[PDB]
Every structure is written in C-alpha cells, then in structure tokens.
Amino acid sequence: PIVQNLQGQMVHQAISPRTLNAWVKVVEEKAFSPEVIPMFSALSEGATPQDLNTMLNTVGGHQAAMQMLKETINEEAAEWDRLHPVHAGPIAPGQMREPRGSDIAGTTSTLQEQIGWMTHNPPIPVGEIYKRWIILGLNKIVRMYSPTSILDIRQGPKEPFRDYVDRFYKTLRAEQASQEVKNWMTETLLVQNANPDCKTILKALGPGATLEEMMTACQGV
Amino acid sequence: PIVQNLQGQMVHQAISPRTLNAWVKVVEEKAFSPEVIPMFSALSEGATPQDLNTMLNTVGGHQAAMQMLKETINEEAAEWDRLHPVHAGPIAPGQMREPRGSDIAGTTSTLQEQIGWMTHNPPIPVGEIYKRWIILGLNKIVRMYSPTSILDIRQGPKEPFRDYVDRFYKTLRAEQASQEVKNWMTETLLVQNANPDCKTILKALGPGATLEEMMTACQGV
Incomplete structure (x- = not known):
C-alpha cells in the first residue's frame, strides 16, 4: 500500500x-x-x-x-x-x-x-x-x-460416486472435528448427501454394507 | 378378503x-x-x-x-x-x-x-x-x-426459540448416538436449524455464547 x-x-x-x-x-x-x-x-x-x-x-x-x-x-x-x-x-x-x-x-x-x-x-x-x-x-x-463445508458436500446428479466419496473424505480429513462427529459423517452423512438415485440404492443395502460395497452398488448411477 | x-x-x-x-x-x-x-x-x-x-x-x-x-x-x-x-x-x-x-x-x-x-x-x-x-x-x-430424527427438527418461521430448543433437546435425548455426535448437535446443528431470522442473530453473537444468551437473543424473533 x-x-x-x-x-x-x-x-x-x-x-x-x-x-x-x-x-x-x-x-x-x-x-x-x-x-x-x-x-x-x-x-x-x-x-x-x-x-x-x-x-x-x-x-x-x-x-x-x-x-x-x-x-x-x-x-x-x-x-x-x-x-x-x-x-x-x-x-x-x-x-x-x-x-x-x-x-x-x-x-x-x-x-x-x-x-x-x-x-x-x-x-x-x-x-x-x-x-x-x-x-x-x-x-x-x-x-x-x-x-464446500462437509455439510454442503453433495453428490452431483451425474457425479460418479467414487469421486463424491473422495471429495467427501478429503473435506472430512481437513476438518478439526471430534471423532464422534466424524464417525457420524462417514456412517450417515455420506449416504444422507448422496444423490437421489444413489441414496435409494444405498438405503436398500444390508445392515453392515462396507464402503467398497457402497461404491460397487452405486457405480454408474 | x-x-x-x-x-x-x-x-x-x-x-x-x-x-x-x-x-x-x-x-x-x-x-x-x-x-x-x-x-x-x-x-x-x-x-x-x-x-x-x-x-x-x-x-x-x-x-x-x-x-x-x-x-x-x-x-x-x-x-x-x-x-x-x-x-x-x-x-x-x-x-x-x-x-x-x-x-x-x-x-x-x-x-x-x-x-x-x-x-x-x-x-x-x-x-x-x-x-x-x-x-x-x-x-x-x-x-x-x-x-423422527434430529436433522429434520427445524425452528418454525413463527416458533418461539425456547420451544424449538425444547423440541430439539427432547429429540436429542431420545436418540442413541455417541457423545461426539451429540456435541455437534448442540454446538452447531441447533443454530444451523434455527429459522432465517434467528440464525442471523445467533451467528452475530460472540465466540462463547451460552444457550441462555441464545434464548435471550432470539426472544420474539
């Protein structure tokens, strides 16, 4: 100046x-x-x-x-x-x-x-x-x-689910939050914030679906 | 039949x-x-x-x-x-x-x-x-x-903030969630889910606003 x-x-x-x-x-x-x-x-x-x-x-x-x-x-x-x-x-x-x-x-x-x-x-x-x-x-x-806050990380209508997962986790890792909050993020928010078509598939999986199973389930949605 | x-x-x-x-x-x-x-x-x-x-x-x-x-x-x-x-x-x-x-x-x-x-x-x-x-x-x-869930507990456009707080906490207490998830609920979701006019007031409070201070701030909003 x-x-x-x-x-x-x-x-x-x-x-x-x-x-x-x-x-x-x-x-x-x-x-x-x-x-x-x-x-x-x-x-x-x-x-x-x-x-x-x-x-x-x-x-x-x-x-x-x-x-x-x-x-x-x-x-x-x-x-x-x-x-x-x-x-x-x-x-x-x-x-x-x-x-x-x-x-x-x-x-x-x-x-x-x-x-x-x-x-x-x-x-x-x-x-x-x-x-x-x-x-x-x-x-x-x-x-x-x-x-781009965790909460506003939302899967795009045409976004490959693997890309959404990456964004989600990258955002997650950079936050300063307690582990119990992060556990809710991985176990519920990720599905919560999936697009309409993937969420419906994800919500019809079993009790113990692994993230790899989730990616398999939503591939090309 | x-x-x-x-x-x-x-x-x-x-x-x-x-x-x-x-x-x-x-x-x-x-x-x-x-x-x-x-x-x-x-x-x-x-x-x-x-x-x-x-x-x-x-x-x-x-x-x-x-x-x-x-x-x-x-x-x-x-x-x-x-x-x-x-x-x-x-x-x-x-x-x-x-x-x-x-x-x-x-x-x-x-x-x-x-x-x-x-x-x-x-x-x-x-x-x-x-x-x-x-x-x-x-x-x-x-x-x-x-x-019934915490995430969809949203303050009504004309709901007294004290009533919203009650609903929020009642819903909170009945959940089976970890403490770190509940801590995020009380410290951030409550404000996150306040109505447009109260949220704006709440977000203009200091770093360490107490819930009682929040209620005082949003009274008749």
Whole structure:
C-alpha cells in the first residue's frame, strides 16, 4: 500500500509476503465460501490497484473464477466511464486528471498515478473503488458456485460416486472435528448427501454394507 | 378378503383383528421407514378395497400422511378413468361393467361388486390395483419425510426459540448416538436449524455464547 518517507513523500510499499501467503491460504482452504469475502477485505486494507492485482495473480489458477472477475471488472469499469466521461480540455495547475475505468483496474495507470489519486485532498480512492469491483465479482462467484463445508458436500446428479466419496473424505480429513462427529459423517452423512438415485440404492443395502460395497452398488448411477 | 362357502359362493371375510393389530403395530413402531411398505404388502394379501380402507382407518390419526395418500389416490383414480372411459351402452349378459376409479378406491362400489370383480374369469383385480395406489402413496410419504430424527427438527418461521430448543433437546435425548455426535448437535446443528431470522442473530453473537444468551437473543424473533 502507501507509506510516508522521512522526507515526506507518499511512496509505495509492496504487500508483505506474509499478507500474501495468508490470502493464498484463505483461498486454498475456503474454496468458494462467503467467508472469503470478509477475509479478502481485511487482507486488502490500504491496497493500491497494483497491490490488488498482485493478490489476484496469486490465486489466478482458479480460471473460471478469474474469468468471472474479469467480466465484472469490465462491466463496472464501463459504467464508471459512463458516469465519468473523458474531458479533453487542459488540466488546471491545481487539478488532477480523473481516473478512467482502466486506470482504476490498474491497467492503464502507474503506481505513481494510483498513489497520487489515493492521497489527494480529498482522495480519489482508486484502491477502494477497485476493491469494491473485485468484491462484486467475488459475491457473484460464491453465489454461482456454493461453499464446500462437509455439510454442503453433495453428490452431483451425474457425479460418479467414487469421486463424491473422495471429495467427501478429503473435506472430512481437513476438518478439526471430534471423532464422534466424524464417525457420524462417514456412517450417515455420506449416504444422507448422496444423490437421489444413489441414496435409494444405498438405503436398500444390508445392515453392515462396507464402503467398497457402497461404491460397487452405486457405480454408474 | 374372500372365501368360498360350502354352498360355493365367494363371500367376504373381514380382516382378522390380529392382522389389523399387527398392521397398527407396524405403523406405530416403524414410523415412516421403507420397511413399512413391504409389511403393508404382506399384511394386505387378498384384501378387497373395503379391507384396504379398513387398514387405513386404523392408522388415520397420521393426518399429514393420510392427506398424501388421498392426493395420490385421487391422481391414480383420475388416470384410471382416462384409460377406462365410461361406456353408456347396455351390458351383455356375459359381460361385467368395468370399475371406475372411485369403484376401485371403494368409494362408489359395494363389497359385493368388489368381490364380483376380483373373482371374475379372468379377474378385475380391484384389490390389487387399489393396493398399488396405496403403495405409490406410501413411497411418496417415506421419500418426503424422514422418520423422527434430529436433522429434520427445524425452528418454525413463527416458533418461539425456547420451544424449538425444547423440541430439539427432547429429540436429542431420545436418540442413541455417541457423545461426539451429540456435541455437534448442540454446538452447531441447533443454530444451523434455527429459522432465517434467528440464525442471523445467533451467528452475530460472540465466540462463547451460552444457550441462555441464545434464548435471550432470539426472544420474539
């Protein structure tokens, strides 16, 4: 973000590797939970547009999500420009040229320009504005794809049961829960959360069906 | 069902009080288990439509289930009639008027007519047909509502939270579950299953909210 020299200039300080590592951990662990959004906001405090793009490049491997963010950003940038039409006239010595949508997204603007806008009196808060666009994007992402908590791990209508089992157990293993809670998860929730067609098959098995028997029973359902 | 006189007539014999008592015991004990359906079928062997209605009157106190059976029966009866349109012409001396949907459900038909249909050569098996409709109904009932369980204990949109807590804990105490599963029930499911307005309040409490604090927080929600 932004820090002041002993010589009085507002200069840029890159986001700490520890803040960055935390953000990447949040995304890794909190898949697409509503919980990501508040964390993103906390971690991106004070960020310039350059910093925000730095955070996003760190979780860019999520290509379908990055695509969703791109479209949101392009949309909001386009509306910004509609509300803030380009003005060709000269800039008075005590004015500052307003940012365009692409300046806010960091695409057509420099760090120096971002800092000049952010620390103006009053600010042109391009870090906060870009952050709002990203948050709009993140909300659209979570709303389109649901969280992944144990309880919300549900077999898809066409998901091979072996794949569902894997997801289920992976999610299970990463949780911090007591063994009695985990025992309920394996013995009842797994069937509880199977799709309609597999559940019906699973529920018609015997008293002591083994997981391997379950997989055999639901193969190609 | 149906039995033959020494004089050769097929006459009606009421269902034995012991068969009836067994069926009522099955329903009492096997709440809404898939197990009810095979039992119902075994116990209703040979039943005329009158007999089937006799069995249902015996477990009629289950009003939400009886309502579900009514709707299924009305639906199937309506399709029967579509497949079996009324024919106004005279009936030949060696023919028998076909049953309507309501005749099969026993509503517009007499025991004598039911027996006449059932023992025709070949039969018009109105007992078996009505039994299939009832079974369609029972399957819909089990599939819709689980047998008494903690997971489907949900606070009503206008239910005082103290009443929900009572129901929840009563259900909890009667279960045979491990302590770690019950700990998850009290610490997370109770909030999980609160209504939309109470959950939002509960989720905005601190790290260590006591149940008494929860009740205070959700009072009149």
